[PDB]
Amino acid sequence: AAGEIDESLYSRQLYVLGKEAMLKMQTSNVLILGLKGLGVEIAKNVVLAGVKSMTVFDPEPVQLADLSTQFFLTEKDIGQKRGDVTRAKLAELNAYVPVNVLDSLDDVTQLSQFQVVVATDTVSLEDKVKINEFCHSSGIRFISSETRGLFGNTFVDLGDEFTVLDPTGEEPRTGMVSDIEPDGTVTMLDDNRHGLEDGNFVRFSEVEGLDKLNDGTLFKVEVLGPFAFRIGSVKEYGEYKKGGIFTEVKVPRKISFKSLKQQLSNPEFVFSDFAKFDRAAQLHLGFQALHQFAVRHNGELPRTMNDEDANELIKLVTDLSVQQPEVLGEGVDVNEDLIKELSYQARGDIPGVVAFFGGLVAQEVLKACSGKFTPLKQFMYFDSLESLPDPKNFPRNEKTTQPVNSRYDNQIAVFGLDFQKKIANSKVFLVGSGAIGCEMLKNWALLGLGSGSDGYIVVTDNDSIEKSNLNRQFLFRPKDVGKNKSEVAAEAVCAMNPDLKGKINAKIDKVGPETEEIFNDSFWESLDFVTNALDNVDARTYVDRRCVFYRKPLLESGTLGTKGNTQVIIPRLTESYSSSRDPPEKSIPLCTLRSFPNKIDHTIAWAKSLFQGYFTDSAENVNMYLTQPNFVEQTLKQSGDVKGVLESISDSLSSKPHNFEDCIKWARLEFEKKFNHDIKQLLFNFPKDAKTSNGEPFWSGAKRAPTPLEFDIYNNDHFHFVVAGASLRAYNYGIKSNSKPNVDEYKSVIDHMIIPEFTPNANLKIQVNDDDPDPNANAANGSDEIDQLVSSLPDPSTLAGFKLEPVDFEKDDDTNHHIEFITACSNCRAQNYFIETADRQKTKFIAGRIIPAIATTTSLVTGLVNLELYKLIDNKTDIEQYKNGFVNLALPFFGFSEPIASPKGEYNNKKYDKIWDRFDIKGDIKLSDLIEHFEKDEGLEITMLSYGVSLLYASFERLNLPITQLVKLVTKKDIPAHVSTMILEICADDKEGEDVEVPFITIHL
Ligand SMILES: Nc1ncnc2c1ncn2[C@@H]1O[C@H](COP(=O)(O)OP(=O)(O)OP(=O)(O)O)[C@@H](O)[C@H]1O
Ligand SMILES: [Cl-]
Ligand SMILES: [K+]
Ligand SMILES: [Mg+2]
Ligand SMILES: [Mg+2]
Ligand SMILES: [Mg+2]
DSSP states (O other): OTTOOOHHHHHHHHHHHOHHHHHHHTTOEEEEEOOSHHHHHHHHHHHHHOOSEEEEEOOSBOOGGGGGTOTTOOGGGTTSBHHHHHHHHHHTTOTTSOEEEOOOOSSGGGGGGOSEEEEOTTSOHHHHHHHHHHHHHHTOEEEEEEEETTEEEEEEEOOSOEEESBSSOOOOOEEEEEEEOTTOEEEESTTOOOOOOTTOEEEEESOBTOGGGGSSOOEEOEEOSTTEEEOOOOGGGOOOOBOOEEEEEOOOEEEOOOOHHHHHHSOOBOOSOGGGTTHHHHHHHHHHHHHHHHHHTTTOOOOTTOHHHHHHHHHHHHHHHHHOHHHHOTTOOOOHHHHHHHHHHTTOOOHHHHHHHHHHHHHHHHHHHHOBSOOOOSEEEEEOGGGSOOTTTSOOSTTTTOOOSSTTHHHHHHHOHHHHHHHHTOEEEEEOOSHHHHHHHHHHHHHTTTOSTTOEEEEEOOOBOOGGGGGTOTTOOGGGTTSBHHHHHHHHHHHHOGGGTTOEEEEOOOOSGGGTTTSOHHHHHTOSEEEEOOOSHHHHHHHHHHHHHHTOOEEEEEEETTEEEEEEEOTTTBOOTTTTOOOOOOOOOHHHHHTOOOSHHHHHHHHHHHHHIIIIIHHHHHHHHHHOTTHHHHHHHTOSSHHHHHHHHHHHHHTOOSSHHHHHHHHHHHHHIIIIIHHHHHHHHSOTTOBOTTSSBSSOTTOOOOOOOOOOTTSHHHHHHHHHHHHHHHHHTTOOOOOSOOHHHHHHHHHTOOOOOOOOOTTOOOOOSSSSOOTTSGGGTOTTTHHHHHHTSOOGGGGTTOOOOOOOOOTTOTTSSHHHHHHHHHHHHHHHHTOOOOOHHHHHHHHTTOOOOOHHHHHHHHHHHHHHHHHHHTTOOOGGGOOEEEEETTTTEEEEEOOOBOOEEEETTEEEETTTOEEEEESOOBHHHHHHHIIIIIOOOOOEEEETTEEEEEOOOOOOOBHHHHHHHHTTSOOOOSOSEEEEEEEEEOTTSOEEOOOEEEEEO
């Protein structure tokens, strides 16, 4: 099993961590001490990630209050040992990870069986120090974490010696160079930014004239603006001539950690929130004081909301400040109000805080196992005090926060009973049931959100469960693959908290325009707020627009590998998701794709397009030509690529295969065309020694002169191009004939083919720049030469019943030849242009647009969302109380900012909210009266009334049609069915005679 990773399970996580880090993880034995909510959350993430084994220690009996955040305990478990009852449920998370229970820790030498030891808040500070001393002195990595109500911390001690092998997890930077001067000044090609920072290291390739500079030697970077950097003298290597590519290399970094005992008096802090810098040292003394309080008082924490205990904690912190003078520093007084809240909340057990630290700490465990990413060094403290409701609405005292003998006692401890009841009675829509959705439903189950008679949860997701989902969608099991995500998730969390039984309406509908009959006005209007758990801009933007329309708050969030974000959208207050979006990533120039690739990303895009044309569009165009009597006529109206469409039909029918041998021949001939003849044609038009107008080499920089390929069936890429191409063609034409192709079989067919020789077309123009005109446009064909191709098409009557079967691209079925073809095809073109070839996993990442994902980040971001949710429940209108988050666990880095206020505008002298305000019109008004009323009371000379894309009115004949009739007219005579409201968008002029931006209209039918 050594060295093997199950890519079909770990696919998305492999794109975060890499194979080497996971191989180190699969050798590491982890021990977690304490299996309340914090411990089980950490264990859940580490077991999903795949370590060698997980061992849990917790002999304490389950009590009902433990269920606040321990999602694997049930009321039937009370009195049993937490470790014992949790082991079997953790074991079900990942069959590759054995989960054991450690019965006793009296003998500390047992720790020597483990590589990483995690001490949660069940471990006293006295025991944490003893355990850390044993781990530190033995070479065992040590991590501890504690949560106390809305506060928490983590401590990391990986020993005297630890090597970071990759500090960031980012793709290495690369770039093309146009000069390296004798002093090492490197000039970037054209406008290309290097993207490097001082102190980075690079190696070089293709630098002609400097020979051994390309041998993998590393050079330390001194940046000289964003388009040049310096590497020190290169005189010893020669004299630059031309060419070159730099590649950033991450070098190992040896670091050293101090023990817990040393760090108690002289801590090294990583801050979680730059608005709260000064709180870290205060909380550092406070968390210690809580332990001292417990040793005084028979192991008990301060009493909930108890002011006597709080005053005692403050004195403990004061005394400790004198013993630990370097913590606060000189002249800094104890923040007594802060310590008071810590005392008041010490017993609290809050799902969002547990999820935040569970995700952070589990990732630190994986860093400890692997050397991947930069460990936290060494203390981080956190609070989410902004989550507290306004005491005017929900007073906090010993009466309101007292236990009621329920699983929620330690959330009540913080928020009070009435606030928890308001959570129970909340009405929420969750859009999506994947990674964030599953974690979200778990958090809500622990909150009891929707368990109240007036509350409920709706969750919708049209997708089914797939194997790779299981790595981070922890409510799903191997047996659940193929079932509907939302339905399985709802059932799973109601087992975790039967209080939610019957309160989760699991739907399998896709959210978007086509389901507004389902998600109608009554549906949205009833909601308290909406939570997104989506993975695409279209769905996120659509939900955002509904939330704006219905003025519902929206909780947005996302992850990308180790990075994540949260966004709070509040009606009449903040920007929305849509207005905050970033302009799209610039696309690859078409000439670069078509003729001058220089990165594997370019050859993969090209190969994916060829795949689409060969095996999807070609088949569809045939079927349409055979089925629609007007196809040819339509194809000149619709056009786009008339020449290409008609040629594909003619090719598809004239060269139809009769057996599998015919498909092999076809694929071998396409190999010759794409990787030999077309390349000789390019070189005919642009000889290797050709010059531009200004006498410089045409083939320089981003233009890499290719060499045609001579087919070699022992080259893996040539072989698999033909295998995959033939199999997909055989699929197209319903031919049948092996998962293992036989090289000798294929070789016998190909060996006996006659391969047409290349003859150049000497009258072609190939586009060099995208600014230049397009030689291969419909305008570049001619209205006369298409007739030949049309009349040469066989009439459908000669092909009765003939049908081609189009391929639907599926990146995640490794037996279907899709990624095989794209990888081989890409790599053959990479061979043409001397680009390094890529394996199937990288090709699948790019061609499939897979998003790197891991449960640690998913759980952490979800925790942060639920800390903002508390603020919706209190109807907070102070924008300064909300927190938009950005996280990068690689670093680790945490940043928070208050949301951005909605832009405000003026159609002069009237102030409006450019996002949330609109004109509400009662009734199906006649067009003329609507135009009038804008002049009457809004003083607007309306100039463009549009419904969706079309313009119902434009000043560039005359209508007295009620809007509902007007829309029918211009939308090909369709009848609105369930529509009670209609959104219209206006362009207008103001009383001063000037065009103004104006809010949209709602027609209430
Ligand atoms: N318009 C929509 N309506 C409802 N659910 C949606 C919509 N668009 C996307 N989703 C859901 O959002 C969820 C996003 O979760 P996530 O991306 O973790 O899972 P996934 O897409 O199956 O995994 P992967 O991206 O790794 O294949 C998906 O389950 C997806 O079905
Ligand atoms: Cl390359
Ligand atoms: K020519
Ligand atoms: Mg400098
Ligand atoms: Mg999916
Ligand atoms: Mg997805």
